[model samples]
Target: VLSAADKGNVKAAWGKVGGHAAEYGAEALERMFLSFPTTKTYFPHFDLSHGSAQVKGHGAKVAAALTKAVEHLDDLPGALSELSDLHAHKLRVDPVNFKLLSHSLLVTLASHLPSDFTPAVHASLDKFLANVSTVLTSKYR
Candidate 1:
């Protein structure tokens, strides 16, 4: 559960990320694929090449979902219910990959938003991502 301070930090950090979620998301996915090659297995249909359009498109989708998550922070599971079903039942993505993406996202944010990615904000974002991951994987048996 995110505390009040955590929620504040998350919203503030997202304010800095406004309008560039797609770019950051794509970079995060690229970093994840490069750092953890095993993650590419889930995207067999994607071109998986550097700067692939497919990856960028999917990254936009991921970023959109996260944007929604940020908006509905108080109701994360409800906000992401459809995504939870898709990921857990249809995609059957490994839960471990969520952490990999979270790490990559943190790196991406830190690199791009150096001035705004302070320690407190980092902890808040980490908690937010972990909560999102938990919600996404909740339906898995």
Candidate 2:
């Protein structure tokens, strides 16, 4: 449940990082693999290397989805639920992995947008990500 201010902050900060979405996204995924090694097994193409083309491509997609998610902030859960169905059923991703991804993404975003990623922004993102993750894994529940 994002407040109006939370929505505004997310949108504005998203805009700041939009240009480097791929870079930040890639770094998030990379950090996830490092922090949660089990996740790598799910993606056969994940090399865990610094400059893997596969990682970059997947990261770009992740960033694009996130961009759209932010654009549709009011319907964030709905948007993620659709992707979640595919990822949960077809890809068979563990729901817990989403939480791990969020953690890494936060770290990446904080590093990239130190000034804009304030504590309030962090709380909003944390709650937003947790809600997104919950919606994403709802079917599993």
Candidate 3:
């Protein structure tokens, strides 16, 4: 669970990332694919090249989901229930992939929002992503 300070830091950092969610999301995914090639297995059907349209579109969806998560910070599991089911049942993605993406997202945000990515903000965002990842991976057996 996030402390009050944690929530504040997350929201403040997210505010800085406000309009660049999709772009950041795409960069995060690209970073993940480049650094952790195994993650690409989950999106074998989509083009993984740099600046791929499919990647951008999917990244938007991912950013949307994260936005939703931010809105429902008090109920992450409820907010991401459907996505959890999809990943666990349909996608069958390894739980580890969630952490990889989270790391990529953090790096992307830090790279793009240097001043806002203070140590406190980074810790808060990391905790927030871990909570989201736990919810998304909960349905796995």
Candidate 4:
């Protein structure tokens, strides 16, 4: 569980990203695809190039999901379960890749919010993302 202060900080920082969600999401997705080449195969139709519309749209989608997920951290499992179900069943995405995306997302957020993504906040975010990945991947079992 996150401390009250960490929760406040996380929500506040997320609001900042929400202002430019697509930009941040694209950056994170680009980093992920670059760092983990295997993930690119999942999006056969996406250009996978930097700054493309598909890239940006995918990013915005992720940010939107994250925003919703954060809003209901008390029910993250339920929130993400529906999402994971789509990916796991319909999209047929490998659940392991979520962790890679989570790491890249951290990189994106840290790059965009260097001042706000401090060590303490990073630790909290790491914990949050771990929970997110766990919930998302659990369906594979």
Q: How well does each candidate superpose onto the true structure, as a TM-score?
A: 0.98, 0.91, 0.97, 0.89
RMSD to true structure for each model, in Å: 0.7, 1.5, 0.7, 1.7
TM-score of model 3 (CA atoms): 0.97
Q: In candidate 2, which residue pairs clash?
A: none
CA lDDT for candidate 4: 0.82
Count of steric clashes across candidates, in order: 0, 0, 0, 0
RMSD of 2: 1.5
* Residues 77-100 of candidate 1: C-alpha lDDT, one tens digit per residue: 999999999999889999999999
Once fitted onto the true fold, the runs of candidate 3 whose alpha carbons sit more than 4 angstroms away are none
Q: How many backbone clashes does candidate 3 have?
A: 0
Q: Quickly count the clashes in candidate 2.
A: 0
Candidate 1 yields a Cα-based lDDT of 0.94
Please write out the lDDT profile of model 4 over residues 39-72, one tens digit for every residue. 9998988899977889988888988888887798
Candidates sorted by lDDT, best first: 1, 3, 2, 4
lDDT of 3 by residue, 1-141 (tens): 999999999888888889899999999999999999999988878899998999999899999999999888999999999999999877888889999999999999999999899898999999999999998988866
lDDT of 3: 0.92
